[PDB]
């Protein structure tokens, strides 16, 4: 078999290529996206953050959401590094919220399991929520931090 094999992968997709965390919109506005980072880089990098995602209505931003006035070009930024765990950074004009708690802009916060970021606060009808899903696979490798396989 050859061509048929390619079809088999169509139904059975291999999830977890090198994903760090997943972003899911609970308010139903933006399509689910998956944040990823290279393990080799994370293992080699001892200082600073390995990789950070920028979210906003800008097509540049690592994450693209609905073009909302309450949101900024780069509404928020997510960073993964340090001795494990993940960090959430806000970069919006109108502010970024975490589970109803407004965090300090351009500030790093300790990620939470299935956490959620709210944005567009100020107008009851202009708030958007986002949920972050962290895969245990990434943490599993970080715990071992040992290389013994190709790709």
């Amino acid at each position: 078999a050859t061509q048929r094999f390619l079809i088999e992968k169509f139904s059975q997709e291999q999830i977890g290529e090198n994903i760090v965390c997943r972003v899911i919109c609970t308010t139903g506005q933006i399509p689910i996206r998956d944040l990823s980072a290279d393990i080799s880089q994370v293992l080699k990098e001892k200082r600073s953050i390995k990789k950070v995602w920028t979210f906003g209505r800008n097509p540049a931003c690592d994450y693209h959401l609905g073009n909302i006035s309450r949101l900024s070009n780069k509404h928020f930024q997510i960073l993964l590094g340090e001795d494990g765990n993940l960090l959430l950074n806000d970069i919006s004009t109108n502010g970024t919220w975490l589970n109803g708690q407004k965090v300090e802009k351009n500030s790093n916060q300790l990620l939470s399991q299935g956490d959620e970021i709210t944005v567009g606060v100020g107008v009851e009808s202009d708030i958007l929520s986002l949920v972050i899903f962290i895969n245990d696979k990434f943490k599993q490798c970080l715990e071992q931090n040992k290389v013994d396989r190709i790709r």
Binding site: N94, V123, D126
Partner: peptide
Amino acid sequence: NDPDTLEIYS
């Protein structure tokens, strides 16, 4: 072809 940032109207 232009952004738009604000902080609610009041």
